[PDB]
Design a protein around this ligand. Structure first.
Ligand code: E55
Ligand SMILES: *[C@@H]1O[C@H](CO)[C@@H](O[C@@H]2O[C@H](CO)[C@@H](O[C@@H]3O[C@H](CO)[C@@H](O)[C@H](O)[C@@H]3O)[C@H](O)[C@H]2NC(C)=O)[C@H](O)[C@H]1NC(C)=O
Ligand code: NAG
Ligand code: NAG
Lengths: 276, 140
């Protein structure tokens, strides 16, 4: 094969080999297949019917722009599926069908604007979905999230999100055992509406390197299981009594915070401000 | 009710009194002395904890003339590498530190200022002591 072999009948790296179509001169038991940087442009029905045994698949930067129903149809054992940097624009409302075993799913920078039309709905076994560096402005998990009864990490960093509203995390209410970690870093966020996290169960929450100047008194207060939280490198306003709520909260949850949210202009830790 | 004079100053005077049964010794030197309208200085402290300063933190009970501010917790010594050297202080160890401090003024008020500072730390957190700090005013 013009491909490379790292593990016989197991792992092939057909990377950078100018393919225009899915090879197949590769064993039928292959388990790990890297097809990154190959002008594949379109993935049509059954695009992989020759690898019923794949586990990990990489299709990073493959200029793909379309994926239709059953594209991965017989990849029952697929756990990972990296679809990074692919100018997708049309996405089959059946695209991922057949991915019964999927667990991880990178979709970094795949020109996404909203998870509303992101057909992962039936991806029950999914464990982590990274849709970082995209074009999402409003982040409002849609109903289908319900079926994501195992999702434990959801990255949404570096998008175009400027604000967190109530509704935005709603569906989670109906998710009791959800030990979800949620990353929302490097976003143009500067507004979190009150009641946003009320009655929600986040294990880890990251709101660092955004543009928050202040938050709503009690915004976290009723946030079950929260073990880690990032709030550093933000343009925090340390004026009394505004900052008060947080300054306290942090002190109360010191062990929870990672890094130290500081004061804009001051540089002084927020947790050091005792207001009158 | 044995009052201990900390430091008399141009804008006020400081003093404290134990608010706990066991009344262990403490050398608290503020230098210079707090100026109620703002000033920095060196809080100097000599003590000797009965408990490992590990998770050391103060519960502050401030009370300005007319009102008092809810119970505020202020952590010192997180499990961090950034903590003040003394967070290493085990039980019977001597804590002879000095610490910089900067007090940003209070604008126009002479009433007496009463602040209680309940110290807590060590594995199962316990009270290391309590101190009632009274600070009287008379700008001349
Ligand atoms: C404030 C340092 C005083 C040093 C000398 C203290 C002498 C005896 C202690 C008595 C209790 C003092 C309690 C002070 C509480 C107020 C803190 C504060 O300044 N907050 C302002 C606040 O200050 C912010 C922080 O500045 C500094 O930190 P940073 O530079 O990182 O930000 C301040 N820190 C410092 O200047 C240095 C330190 O705290 C180091 C303390 C080290 C303690 C080590 C103990 C070791 C013990 C070892 C053996 C176990 C922060 O205060 C920390 C207070 C800890 C008190 C512990 C006392 C233990 C005594 C043990 C014997 C302040 O929040 O600024 C606000 C404005 O922000 C824009 C002020 O509000 P305003 O804008 O409306 O004016 C705010 O002041 C508002 C008035 C205040 C009441 C003031 C009452 C009178 C206090 C007179 C001393 O709050 C109601
Ligand atoms: C997310 O976290 C929740 C809540 O912390 C997890 O629920 C917990 O699940 C365990 C089972 O893994 C329950 O324990 C059960 O009872 C005893 C344990 O003492 C054991 O004999 C049983 O075999 C079984 O393990 C536990 O009661 C239950 N809730 C709690 C905390 O009381 C859940 O597993 C996690 N799920 C996800 C999606 O991460
Ligand atoms: C495929 C389909 O339309 N069926 C729905 C779907 O939400 C889910 O797969 C199923 C099992 O929970 O419940 C029902
Ligand atoms: C390739 O896989 C086949 C299928 O079992 C096996 O016959 C062959 O030995 C493998 N390659 C070798 C010789 O290692």
């Amino acid at each position: 094969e013009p491909c490379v072999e790292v593990v016989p009948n197991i792992t092939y790296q057909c990377m950078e080999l100018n393919f225009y179509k899915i090879p197949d001169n590769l064993p039928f038991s292959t388990k790990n297949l890297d097809l990154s940087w190959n002008p594949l442009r379109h993935l049509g029905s059954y695009s992989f019917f020759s690898f019923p045994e794949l586990q990990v698949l990489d299709l990073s930067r493959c200029e793909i722009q379309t994926i239709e129903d059953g594209a991965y149809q017989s990849l029952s054992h697929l756990s990972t599926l990296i679809l990074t940097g692919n100018p997708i624009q049309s996405l089959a409302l059946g695209a991922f069908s057949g991915l019964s075993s999927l667990q991880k799913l990178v979709a970094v920078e795949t020109n996404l604007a909203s998870l509303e039309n992101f057909p992962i709905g039936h991806l029950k076994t999914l464990k982590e979905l990274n849709v970082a560096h995209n074009l999402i402005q409003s982040f409002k998990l849609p109903e289908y999230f319900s079926n994501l009864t195992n999702l434990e990490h959801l990255d949404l960093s570096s998008n175009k999100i400027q604000s967190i509203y109530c509704t935005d995390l709603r569906v989670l209410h109906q998710m009791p055992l959800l030990n979800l970690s949620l990353d929302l870093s490097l976003n143009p966020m500067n507004f979190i509406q009150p009641g946003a996290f009320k009655e929600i169960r986040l294990k880890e929450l990251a709101l660092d390197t955004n543009q928050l100047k202040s938050v709503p008194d009690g915004i976290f207060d009723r946030l079950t299981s929260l073990q880690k939280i990032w709030l550093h490198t933000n343009p925090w306003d340390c004026s009394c009594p505004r900052i008060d709520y947080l300054s306290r909260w942090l002190n109360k949850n010191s062990q929870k915070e990672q890094g130290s949210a500081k004061c804009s202009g001051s540089g002084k830790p927020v947790r050091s401000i005792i207001c009158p | 009710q044995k009052q201990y004079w900390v430091c008399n100053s141009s804008d006020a005077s400081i003093s404290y009194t134990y608010c706990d049964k066991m009344q262990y010794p403490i050398s608290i030197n503020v230098n210079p002395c707090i100026e109620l309208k703002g000033s920095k200085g060196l809080l100097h402290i000599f003590y000797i904890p009965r408990r490992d300063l590990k998770q050391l933190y103060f519960n502050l009970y401030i009370t300005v003339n007319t009102m008092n501010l809810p119970k505020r917790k202020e952590v010192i010594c997180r499990g961090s590498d950034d903590d003040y050297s003394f967070c290493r202080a085990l039980k019977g160890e001597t804590v002879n530190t000095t610490i910089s401090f900067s007090f940003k003024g209070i604008k126009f008020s002479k009433g007496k200022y009463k602040c209680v500072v309940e110290a807590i730390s060590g594995s199962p957190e316990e009270m290391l002591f309590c101190l009632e700090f009274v600070i009287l005013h008379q700008p001349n």
